[PDB]
Design a protein around this ligand. Structure first.
Ligand SMILES: Cc1ncc(C[n+]2csc(CCOP(=O)(O)OP(=O)(O)O)c2C)c(N)n1
Ligand SMILES: Cc1ncc(C[n+]2csc(CCOP(=O)(O)OP(=O)(O)O)c2C)c(N)n1
Ligand SMILES: [Mg+2]
Ligand SMILES: [Mg+2]
Lengths: 670, 671
């Protein structure tokens, strides 16, 4: 043993613990407990380059137990990856680079946003898929361009969440040996001892999932064993490795091993006492000794030396294989393939009707041919979701350089893995399930929006239009949910041109996740639909004529917009009205537009103008743009689509009656 | 004998005919699981066909809900309220036989399934109830509650996180009254399970502290199915998983292919299958006299067992009348006498309190008079304020308690809470931070669809929670809940409204309630009233009789007190006539007559300033309001006061927005 390692570990414990104390808010116990793991990971195990936190061959790190953020920030400070001491002292303060739970959009060296338990460890499964795939796709005998590992720390909370139960099952099924998960086995959660609620035999469970399991019995002091088990885990490339590290929460302090150690239970005096216990100066606050600084300066230098060897190898590879090097650079710069928009199909009303889910499958297969970086799949609904890619193969154990993932019945794990694939870099991932079952996964979908992860969510069977599977499958509240979530696009295309526009919208908004809502049965290709105009959220398909007849606006989207065209025929020829038709594929994209544009389309500054909307979902929000509408403020039915639409008034005849009734009443009041 | 095989095969074939008639649905699992079903209803399960709400019945759950045609066939054969004409109306509008089972529609359907993983997780809650009631009420001579929970699930349920969570809790609590039969058929929709699902299930469930049993030939070895179920029942210290290997679509042309999952057998195919199984291929929707006679005898034997129980319960009720009356009251869903006396009352003279703490006071008050109150928090008992003083945890070998430590398992917690309600006899509650109910929305939405009367305590409801930051601060959740049918979301502003929110929950017994509660202290407000919370919005201070220009300020939760501070400025510095409206619940308000809604909000007046403040998405606000402060972005890791200052949650910013709206309206009207 060299005392410098123990000195580093103990100064990391106390600096980390000081951040919540300064903020009077946050968690000290796990940062103290996990300091040995962190010292080992950053000083000996992980390969990174402090001057380029986006190095394409870095080992990615994820703190799944995100409440331990003070530990991560201490490590990013010590390894000079972009945090100053003043940043550390700004822990949990407005606008700081050190929020109470790590956010990848705020802080360099933070790969994903954690805090909601189970997400980070599931994200890491997706990064391990990426690491295996790219090694298989690009490495040669002499050039190991991608040879990196995914390291994560988690606690008991992540081990209980279903999202990580799902992701861990897939990780074992796929044999992702590049994943190393260190579990802080400290017998503590917020309510108290884990014995209150959590007594699984974790080792036996993870062996049943096809993980390799290793153990460190004294994770507070045996940092050489932590290093040894990590190094041995890396040698087993056919199984993800779980390392169960036994620690004491708040080790060495007054609150050690009690559930109060979870949070902020060490004041100034308690930290002085802990510093004395650990052999440090109790009078120096926010202090790193010269010897520890010198140690981490040397760590940084050794990391850079390893980076320079890779860089020289990459330059040699790039001379020998220029077109492959060009592809790698393009993918990791998030640049899109040359002439990619030529892959988006175009249609006219003379083409045969098609379901928008099927039209989406045509687009997916078209762009798959020119996007080497496209990756994803369905949660056991590949045919119904139309996500299958012709002539591609499944990612499977010992065959990672493929594009299609069989997620199985794991919506939440799916989306978190999809998040991890995007966050790794170099990928444009997509996922699929029925729209109604994305709420199984909203924990991870909300994080895509907060994290700016550019993921594509194919969501078919978007309404009661799906028919006999019934109310447990028919969304009512989901469109409203998505429209109420910041930085998320929900697009509900009406026909083939608009499906192409929905994919165009996704790739034109590269910091925002997209959900494309798609219908089950065929709908007609409509007059004047335009892919580029989907980007504006709403646009006019047929404007007012030049007559002096009373004016009406009909608006719709998805599988009901064609009903507005049918209603227009009746209103025009049977009731002598002047009807505008507006397509409303995306509320979120529309809200981005200047108000002058929004009023030019919806004319919602006119109180007496009939402004109609139809949508098979909750009417929450409709009063913003509309003053007469048909929605669904109830659960659905197990019945054929036509019977549901008849019962709920999704017919041209009912649109007509609603508009006429609004107008007759308006005229009488006028 | 041959009768059991004949019963099984007629069940296979009648079940397979319902989707064919509807030209929609799933034939393979109903065929594959028919032997399990025959054994469960004919030999294992104790029920009473004339009372599907018998309090000591064995509850059954079909977790692989796409197999609904099988369940309906059994409810028909055991005469539990479905006719042949109902079976022929499978998946038709208004029928009692929807494509996935719905407890609100069909007698003998205990929970609503179809979303995978839910039913098996509900069954864990049902097993908690069965263990709890046995411990609470049984005596040496009177086994009032001695029943078991039976469930069938497929591969999909075994992959879903909600059931991974619930199964972990089931093993931790040692719920030996739970028996789960797993249809291990190597098939899901995409194809072979080896595409995505290769766990060693037996070893995994042993690690979760389940007992695991197996039936290697679940297509034909029905005696072994019966044997393993009966042995599973004898181990009361562990839930039992029975891994039943079947062939999806066994005996038919699609046997063992993923095409068998859905609708892949036509009229000719079913004739061929009937010949394979020794049945008359020319008779459709047919049960033979021999099979009808067999199930008539089953029903009579179940009734004999019920009469024995009823006689014992009558003897118990004479010896312990007060206890018997409590059991009856709980299972009737009736509330204790004078229960509303448990709801505290406050005035503006009382000291400020956080609404989460005030909720904790109400919970402990009603706990004293509600023996049927049960629940807990997902590892946030202190922060959610859900702890019950002087109550004990439910734990292995100690089930007659009221508090559940759910651990870090929000989705499993809500599904278990659903199961506790669906069992009968309970008023369950659960708790987590509001932002983490979207982890559990699969189950929460089903509470609404199923009419499960569950209470969801949801604290830390906004950016007001402060430094934990944007991963913890809801923006979209209030809107989601307001957009969900048959669900109440209530955000009480102070102590009186917290009592009103509990009043609202127990006054609306077929609707789940989410109560959104804040972290820090807020003042008790003028004229708040618990009974008025039932109307969703109501006037706290109404207009005076002056001719000064009118303004309405509306708020809820932790921001309503800001409207009082803004009113003081608008009245004293600007001479305006200001109404204050409390808006604790959009969902309760929407169910009021329009005339009431307009009398409160006055949203038929375009030029009247109608203000609202809420720390969440402005989606929906234009229904009642024309000027407002919301949050259409994610939050911040920062102290609450810093966030409110930055985003304009201040009395002075309310004043500026109202005055700017008014100045502009005057200018437009002068034109
Ligand atoms: C999904 C979710 N549910 C709940 C919380 C609240 N919470 C934060 S940490 C924690 C559990 C703490 O246990 P563990 O992960 O073992 O951490 P330790 O206290 O040992 O550091 C919980 C429930 C959360 N952050 N995310
Ligand atoms: C949460 C959820 N996701 C997806 C579906 C769609 N779905 C219905 S059945 C099924 C898989 C069928 O697998 P299994 O449970 O093994 O049933 P089997 O085909 O063997 O009868 C899926 C994905 C669903 N009903 N619920
Ligand atoms: Mg812990
Ligand atoms: Mg199966």
């Amino acid at each position: 043993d060299n005392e410098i390692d123990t000195k580093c570990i103990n100064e990391i414990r106390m600096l980390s613990a000081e951040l919540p104390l300064e903020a009077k808010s946050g968690h000290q116990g796990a940062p103290i407990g996990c300091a040995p793991i962190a010292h080992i990971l950053w000083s000996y195990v992980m390969n990174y380059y402090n001057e380029d936190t986006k190095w394409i061959n870095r080992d990615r790190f994820i703190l799944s137990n995100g409440h331990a953020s003070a530990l991560l920030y201490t490590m990013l400070y010590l390894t000079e990856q972009g945090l100053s001491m003043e940043d550390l002292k700004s822990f949990r303060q407005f606008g700081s680079l050190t929020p109470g739970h790590p956010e990848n959009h705020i802080t360099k060296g933070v790969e994903v946003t954690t805090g909601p338990l189970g997400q980070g460890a599931s994200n890491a499964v997706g990064m391990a898929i990426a690491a295996h795939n790219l090694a298989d796709k690009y490495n040669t005998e002499e050039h190991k361009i991608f040879d990196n590992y995914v390291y994560a720390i988690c606690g008991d909370g992540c081990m209980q969440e279903g999202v990580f139960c799902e992701a861990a099952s897939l990780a074992g099924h796929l044999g992702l040996g590049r994943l190393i998960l260190l579990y802080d086995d400290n017998k503590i959660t917020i309510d108290g001892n884990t014995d209150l609620s959590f007594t699984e035999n974790i080792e036996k469970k993870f062996e049943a999932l096809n993980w390799e399991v290793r153990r460190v019995e004294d994770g507070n002091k045996d940092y050489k064993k932590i290093l040894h088990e990590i190094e041995q885990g890396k040698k087993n490339l056919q199984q993800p490795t779980l390392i169960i590290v036994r620690t004491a929460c708040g080790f060495g302090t007054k609150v050690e091993g009690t559930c109060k150690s979870h949070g902020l239970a060490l004041n100034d005096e308690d930290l002085k006492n802990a510093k004395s216990f650990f052999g440090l100066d109790p009078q120096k606050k926010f202090h790193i000794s010269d010897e520890v600084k010198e140690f981490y300066k040397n760590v940084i230098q050794k990391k850079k030396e390893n980076y320079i060897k890779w860089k020289n190898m990459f330059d040699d590879f790039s001379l020998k294989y220029p077109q492959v090097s060009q592809e790698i650079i393009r993918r990791f710069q998030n640049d899109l393939p040359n002439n990619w928009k030529d892959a988006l199909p175009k249609y006219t009303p003379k083409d045969a009707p098609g379901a928008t889910r099927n039209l989406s499958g045509i687009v997916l297969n078209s762009i798959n041919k020119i996007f080497p970086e496209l990756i994803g799949g369905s949660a056991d609904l590949s045919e119904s979701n139309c996500t299958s890619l012709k002539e591609e193969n499944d990612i499977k154990k010992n065959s990672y350089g493929n594009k299609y993932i069989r997620f199985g019945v794991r919506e939440h794990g799916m989306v978190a893995i999809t998040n991890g694939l995007y966050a790794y870099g170099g990928f444009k991932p997509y996922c699929g399930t029925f729209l109604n079952f994305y709420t199984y996964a909203f924990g991870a979908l909300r994080l895509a929006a907060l994290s700016n992860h550019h993921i594509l969510c194919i969501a078919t069977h978007d309404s009661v239009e799906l028919g006999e599977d019934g109310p447990t499958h028919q969304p009512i509240e989901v469109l409203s949910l998505l429209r109420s979530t910041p930085n998320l696009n929900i697009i509900r295309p009406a026909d083939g041109n608009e499906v192409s526009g929905a994919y165009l919208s996704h790739f034109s908004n590269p910091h925002t996740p997209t959900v494309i809502a798609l219908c089950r049965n065929k709908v007609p290709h409509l007059n004047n639909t335009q892919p580029e105009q989907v980007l504006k959220g709403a646009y006019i398909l047929e404007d007012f004529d030049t007559s002096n007849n009373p004016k009406v606006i009909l608006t719709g989207s998805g599988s009901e917009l064609h009903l507005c065209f049918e209603a227009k025929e009746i209103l025009k020829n049977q009731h002598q009205l002047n009807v505008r038709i507006v397509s409303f594929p995306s509320w979120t994209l529309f809200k981005k537009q200047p108000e002058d544009y929004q009023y030019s389309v919806m004319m919602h500054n006119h109180p007496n103008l009939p402004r109609f909307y139809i949508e098979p979902a909750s009417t929450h929000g409709f009063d913003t743009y509309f003053n007469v509408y048909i929605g669904i403020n109830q659960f659905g039915y197990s019945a054929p689509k036509n019977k549901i639409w008849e019962h709920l008034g999704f017919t041209p005849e009912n649109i007509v009656q609603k508009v006429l009734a609004f107008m007759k009443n308006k005229l009488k009041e006028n």
